[PDB]
Amino acid sequence: PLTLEGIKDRVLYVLKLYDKIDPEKLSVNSHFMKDLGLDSLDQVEIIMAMEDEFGFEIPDIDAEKLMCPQEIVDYIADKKDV
Amino acid sequence: TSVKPIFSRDMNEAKRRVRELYRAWYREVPNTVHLFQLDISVKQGRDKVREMFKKNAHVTDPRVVDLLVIKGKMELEETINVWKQRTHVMRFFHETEAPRPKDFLSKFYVGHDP
Amino acid sequence: MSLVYMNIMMAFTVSLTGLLMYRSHLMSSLLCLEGMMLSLFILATLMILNSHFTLASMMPIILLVFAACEAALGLSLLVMVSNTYGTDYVQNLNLLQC
Amino acid sequence: SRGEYVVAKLDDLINWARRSSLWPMTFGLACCAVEMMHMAAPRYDMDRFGVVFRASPRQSDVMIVAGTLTNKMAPALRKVYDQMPEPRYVVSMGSCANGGGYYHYSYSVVRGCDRIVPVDIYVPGCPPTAEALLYGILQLQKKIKREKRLRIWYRR
Amino acid sequence: MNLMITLLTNFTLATLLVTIAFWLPQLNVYSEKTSPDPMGSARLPFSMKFFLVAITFLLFDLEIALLLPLPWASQTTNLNTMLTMALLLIFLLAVSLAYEWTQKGLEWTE
Amino acid sequence: YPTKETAHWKPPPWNDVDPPKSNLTLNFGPQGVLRLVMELSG
Ligand code: SF4
Numbered sequence A: 001p002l003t004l005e006g007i008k009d010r011v012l013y014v015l016k017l018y019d020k021i022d023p024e025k026l027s028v029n030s031h032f033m034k035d036l037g038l039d040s041l042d043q044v045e046i047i048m049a050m051e052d053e054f055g056f057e058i059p060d061i062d063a064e065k066l067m068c069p070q071e072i073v074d075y076i077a078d079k080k081d082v
Numbered sequence B: 001t002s003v004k005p006i007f008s009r010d011m012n013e014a015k016r017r018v019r020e021l022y023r024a025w026y027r028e029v030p031n032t033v034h035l036f037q038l039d040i041s042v043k044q045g046r047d048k049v050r051e052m053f054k055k056n057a058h059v060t061d062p063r064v065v066d067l068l069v070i071k072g073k074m075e076l077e078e079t080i081n082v083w084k085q086r087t088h089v090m091r092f093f094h095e096t097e098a099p100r101p102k103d104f105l106s107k108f109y110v111g112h113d114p
Numbered sequence C: 001m002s003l004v005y006m007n008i009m010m011a012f013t014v015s016l017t018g019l020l021m022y023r024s025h026l027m028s029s030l031l032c033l034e035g036m037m038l039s040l041f042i043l044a045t046l047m048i049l050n051s052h053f054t055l056a057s058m059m060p061i062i063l064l065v066f067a068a069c070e071a072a073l074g075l076s077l078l079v080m081v082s083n084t085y086g087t088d089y090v091q092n093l094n095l096l097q098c
Numbered sequence D: 001s002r003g004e005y006v007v008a009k010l011d012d013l014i015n016w017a018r019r020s021s022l023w024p025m026t027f028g029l030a031c032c033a034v035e036m037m038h039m040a041a042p043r044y045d046m047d048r049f050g051v052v053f054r055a056s057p058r059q060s061d062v063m064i065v066a067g068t069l070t071n072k073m074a075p076a077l078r079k080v081y082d083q084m085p086e087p088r089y090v091v092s093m094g095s096c097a098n099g100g101g102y103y104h105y106s107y108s109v110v111r112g113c114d115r116i117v118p119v120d121i122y123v124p125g126c127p128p129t130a131e132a133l134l135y136g137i138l139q140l141q142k143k144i145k146r147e148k149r150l151r152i153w154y155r156r
Numbered sequence E: 001m002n003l004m005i006t007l008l009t010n011f012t013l014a015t016l017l018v019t020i021a022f023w024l025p026q027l028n029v030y031s032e033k034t035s036p037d038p039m040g041s042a043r044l045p046f047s048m049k050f051f052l053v054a055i056t057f058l059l060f061d062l063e064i065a066l067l068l069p070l071p072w073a074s075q076t077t078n079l080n081t082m083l084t085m086a087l088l089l090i091f092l093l094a095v096s097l098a099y100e101w102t103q104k105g106l107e108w109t110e
Numbered sequence F: 001y002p003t004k005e006t007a008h009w010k011p012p013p014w015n016d017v018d019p020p021k022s023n024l025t026l027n028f029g030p031q032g033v034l035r036l037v038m039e040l041s042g
Helices: A004-017 A040-054 A069-079 B011-035 B042-055 B062-080 B086-090 B104-110 C003-019 C026-051 C055-085 D002-019 D032-040 D074-082 D094-099 D130-145 D149-155 E002-023 E048-067 E079-102
Strands: D024-028 D062-066 D089-093 D121-123 F024-028 F036-040
Touching: A004 A040, A004 A069, A040 A069, A040 B011, A040 B042, B011 B042, B011 B062, C003 C026, C026 C055, C055 E048, D002 D130, D002 D149, D024 D032, D024 D074, D032 D062, D032 D089, D032 D094, D032 D130, D062 D074, D062 D094, D062 D130, D089 D094, D089 D130, D094 D121, D121 D130, E048 E079
Parallel strands: D024 D062, D062 D089, D089 D121
Antiparallel strands: F024 F036
């Protein structure tokens, strides 16, 4: 929550703990559905991992629009100050 | 062709309810493996959750997937409240059942079924 | 002096140092406090019987009754702490540092 | 030999004490519960055989399955049978406990309680009369009378 | 001394029967049991009312402890004072009971 | 005078009231036959 760079680093750490995402192709602008090739429920457990790490409830109307790690770090940056 | 809805007007609200139900099952699975003291892992129970959701993924009717979300919430409510025993939770994992013959040839060998 | 008085005093000091060195539970502190009271009962009783001082024989009963009433009060305090934090741990009683 | 005689007399002693003090845990599932209650009623009176009326399941000797075992209660029957200390016995009273009975082809009925627990006496009837159930309990006592635990232990 | 012999015999008979009851069926080799409660796994809920009846027992038991020398106290030569203080202790036990009554302390375990 | 030790001490509440931070559930199972889920409050 302190710096945007640490938030992006921790998003990438969460997504490299995620075992279906290959850490080589994983970038910050990588799309979950069409680039990494994930199911919707894969993105759902990604968002719940983000809720486990960042400690706040992400609703459903704004988690469906989180299709890349850049959108995730921008959304968490919106829900906090930075 | 004009039918009465159940909860969802179309497939978007329906997929939202499916998505919330998958979230609730994913959150519940470690508590289920703990308090029922199952002999499986959280990864394995979450894979069974994903299997039960992706089995019904071909459905394009909002009322049918509304009733599927209703019955999934009934299953989850019977699991959070300890109404199922260990046996009812482990009936999803067909452990005592012998593997069925899948190809033509072994189904030909064992009997008459197509 | 008498050799049994040594052991009753040493028991009072053992229960004192138990009451003066907490581990976690407030109930163990209350038990050390009542061990102190028990040793005081025994020591007062052995003196009053030994001296044939007749009117002080009602003294240990009084020493029992008041202190057991005190014990009841202590148990209630523990329960109120146990109704706040779920346990009786003395490290939950640290709000008054600031 | 002498040890054969001693284990014969001791088996006779322990089998006398176990059959002459049977304590039942009765599953009052269905209509057979009423006829078990008539086997406890003052005409037949199981208690004159040493067979007490409603022992608790953690101290009972025999489990009398009296009524229909449905699928929703099959693990409850199995759990009570697993909690019983040995030597535990199971009497199957009446047709639904025996083979499903009138509800044999149902979607919801365990076809006989022998699919769940091992069964020692099958008491047939719908319901079997309280005299027939008392007959089955006396046949269970004769089955306990001819047990050979210490004799087989001495031969093993 | 006879009392110590009797207490030792009672304790020895009790410990003997407990050892027999704990180790006579252990000689049997029955089976090893796996076996994998109304409350499921919930923590023991505290009830204030059981603690209140236990403390009320303790307080009335201290009042009983005061009342116990009365058969010897009746032998005194200050009988007016003895009778006044005896009736006063039983009256204070009664007043403690009345205050426990009228402030709803004896409720739902009345 | 805040030091490094007293750097986490927050002031007490204005009314000196700290927030307190349930009821029993009994499953009278089948052990006729009947299952009951009691929510008891003592
Ligand atoms: S065997 Fe028949 S009469 Fe007996 S309990 Fe079953 S249904 Fe009722």
